[PDB]
Amino acid sequence: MGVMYFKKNEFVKAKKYLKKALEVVKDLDPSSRTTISIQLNLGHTYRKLNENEIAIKCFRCVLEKNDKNSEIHCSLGYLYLKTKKLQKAIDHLHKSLYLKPNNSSATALLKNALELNVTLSLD
Amino acid sequence: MIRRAPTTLQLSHDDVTSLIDDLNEQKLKQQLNI
Amino acid sequence: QDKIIHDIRIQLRKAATELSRWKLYGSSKWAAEALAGLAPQNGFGLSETEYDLYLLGSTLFDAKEFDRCVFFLKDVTNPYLKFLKLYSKFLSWDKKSQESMENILTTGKFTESQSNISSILKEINTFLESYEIKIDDDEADLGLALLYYLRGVILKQEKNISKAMSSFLKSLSCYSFNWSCWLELMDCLQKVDDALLLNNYLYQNFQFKFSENLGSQRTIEFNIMIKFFKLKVFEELNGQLEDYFEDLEFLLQVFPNFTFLKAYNATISYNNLDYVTAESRFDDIVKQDPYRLNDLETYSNILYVMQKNSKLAYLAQFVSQIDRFRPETCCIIANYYSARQEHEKSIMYFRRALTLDKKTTNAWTLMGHEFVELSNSHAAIECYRRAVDICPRDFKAWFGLGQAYALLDMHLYSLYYFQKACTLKPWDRRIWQVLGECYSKTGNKVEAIKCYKRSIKASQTVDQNTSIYYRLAQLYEELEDLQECKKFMMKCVDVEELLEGIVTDETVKARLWLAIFEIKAGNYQLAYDYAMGVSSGTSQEIEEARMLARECRRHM
Incomplete structure (x- = not known):
């Protein structure tokens, strides 16, 4: 849903739904293409929103989670x-x-x- | 039942080209002031 | 001294045995060897049902059957026996953890990936989180430090340097007198200003666990190896030294005939390019400990500069006699083939040495230099890269890239590479001049002068400044500062007097341009004086100078 609402250039409901998804899955899915995917998508949305600061922080935490x-x-x-x-x-x-x-x-x-x-x- | 990779998007070509053009703009205007 | 040296002996005896006990070869080797240079306390928290596994785990590790040991300790709740399993588990992954591109150079064969350690890192976090006593307070013991140290090193693997220092400093507060832990801390710096910041952390924020340590050792400045810590940091990168000389003297009084200090002390001369003193300082240590092989490649390197091939060959013969597969042994041999201009074969031996440790001293860089003489220009450049990622503090690695890219038509990539190395070793006279020469292609003539003028000041000897003086005039010629061209071009003319009238080709161009410039200024008599100053060089400069001399006289 977040990826779609990003595609439609809404940039708002996408972010809200993605944040809801991650707040659902804070405890579980530490790795395995789930946390990394959602976090990178949220950071990319923040970049599109020109909010670059928490973008830097989240991209940094994703990078430290997985380097390659x-x-x-x-x-x-x-x-x-x-x-x-x-x-x-x-x-x-x-x-x-x-x-x-x-x-x-x-x-x-x-x-x-x-x-x-x-x-x-x-x- | 298996899940595939969730859809993720990276930097496109259009936005990076917009940034490259803009960045040429502010590497071009300032030396006129100098 | 008095009881201070005595107190060291007892506690150092510890650091030799338990480190050896739980399979840390590198740390125990330094500590035990320190016993000899220096002029059976037993205890561990174990149960009979659990003590057996330690014997089982340790001897399997000794037989180098790493992977079986992991299975046999699958479920262990011991605070620090778990370290042994994870240590075995980590190394089992490492040996097969070869990056594809580096492997092609590592072998030349020319032909699950990393998730294991992610599980390993999660395991160590899970164990400590669920462990009874954390690192805080006077709790924890020697084994706990090993866990953090193992946690610290694995953090460095994913380039998590910022958290890596926290784990390492945490581990050492719990237990000191572990040499291997500080070695990995060195690679966490890769910068100069952080070192003093880290130094400030040690002097104020850092504190020791006096419970485990003995008397006069909780205090930082009574500790003996915090000096060793200070020795290593100020030799890897000079920067600004603090109490470096004073502390070095004290540690020299203690630890008589300690080979490692002498090697480090002698190594300082090489960093200072004092070759004549360095050989003498190396020569004695060979007599004292002929069978010591660490850091003999440095002895080879200086001999390479002196080109004492006869002396070097016997060194190579002597070294290979007593061992033939240690990394320095292959390294010195590959250096020997370079002296014989046999650059094509020195690669092979460097290749052999590389596979031994794959994180050595500056052996990656030496491998690249030999490729340059082969004009590959592409193996060498990516070769120089491998030194960078492993050790970003290597001056030669960064320099090789910029130097190699200078031969490449594009010079743009070279500026950045030289900029990093410039920060690493600003003292070198060559780098500033080379950077300015490459920076002239940029067209920002103003910044090159600031680099160019600093190159001259750092060049010490004035004779070599003659060539760079002409470069100053050329760049100033691009600007409306032809007067500035003359004032620096007359300087290199003055150096000719200092250089006993070497009248090289550089000042030949300098002398003719002044005569032409003064002729344009109407000073025929002055220009006529430098007209006869060009008495040597190619024919074209001679006939032009005579033309200037003939023209000057007609105007008088």
């Missing part, structure tokens, strides 16, 4: 490039490309971060 995932790294890098934290995002892009060969969108994102690093002149 290209999508989690790519989305966390997207979140960081939304802000100005290039130093902490290009490593994540590095890891995402390391995990999965192509990641064309991730390749473009990392390239852009490259021209940013050229552009910036931080001490």
